Structure 1
Amino acid sequence: MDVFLMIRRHKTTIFTDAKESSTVFELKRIVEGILKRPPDEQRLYKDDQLLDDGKTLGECGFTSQTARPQAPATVGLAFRADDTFEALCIEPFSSPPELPDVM
């Protein structure tokens, strides 16, 4: 029933959970409380696919077999600068060093 997400934008990443039946709009609400930005000023993506506010996370492809606590699903975030929404940009994480010779 619960889905585990990583809402990401720039070098910002939010770890939160929600129900599979919860809507994309309600997720924007959770973001509003945290990053102080109204739902109408934010866009949520799933691998460069804009999501509809009326759709459930389940419908959007976020299920218990895809949004697991140990491997949360990623949701793209884009804010509103002037008339045009900014481009979706997710800064990747650093790369781990070379595997130790003893491993």
Structure 2
Amino acid sequence: MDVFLMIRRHKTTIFTDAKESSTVFELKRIVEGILKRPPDEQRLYKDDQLLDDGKTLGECGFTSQTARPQAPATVGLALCIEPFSSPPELPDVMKPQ
């Protein structure tokens, strides 16, 4: 089974996938292809770590378990991510909370 992964940037997110044996640069190229976005002062960061310009395999912290279909492994893409809208829902009486 491949690995479900989700990347962020501002108000646009990507679902994507790869192998454990892949490098970071492959992810950079998938992103640059899907978004047609050349690296004008933008790279790939893990939970906000530069990863320099990529082309590495030793620092893959996206092990398979953390990149599941039920749950993504998150990539941290001047950075600013707009989060979602937090659930405007309450216990609603029927759920004594």
TM over 0.5: yes
Greater CA drift, 9-18 or 90-99: 90-99
Work out whether 1:12 is the aligned partner of 2:22: no
Q: Distance in 2 between the 1:56 and 1:4 partners?
A: 20
Q: Deviations over 1:7-37 (max 9, x none)?
A: 1101110001111111110101101111102
- Work out which of the two has the higher radius of gyration on C-alpha atoms and give 1 or 2: 2
Offset, 1:68:
1.0
The answer as to whether partners of 1:9 and 1:89 remain within 8 angstroms in 2 is yes
Structure having the larger proportion of residues in strand:
1
The answer as to whether partners of 2:43 and 2:52 remain within 8 angstroms in 1 is no
Q: Distance in 2 between the 1:4 and 1:57 partners?
A: 18
5+ residue gaps, structure 2, are none
**Correspondence for 1:100:** 91
Offset, 1:38:
2.7
Greater CA drift, 56-65 or 17-26: 56-65
Partner secondary structure for residue 69 of structure 1? coil
The structure-2 alpha-carbon separation of the partners of 1:3 and 1:39, relative to structure 1 and needing over 3 Å to count, comes to: farther
The answer as to whether partners of 1:4 and 1:69 remain within 8 angstroms in 2 is yes
The TM-score normalised by the length of structure 2 is 0.79
Q: Distance in 2 between the 1:39 and 1:71 partners?
A: 28
The TM-score normalised by the length of structure 1 is 0.75
Task: Determine what percentage of the aligned residue pairs are the same residue.
Answer: 100
Offset, 1:43:
0.7
Aligned residues: 94
The structure-2 alpha-carbon separation of the partners of 1:63 and 1:88, relative to structure 1 and needing over 3 Å to count, comes to: same
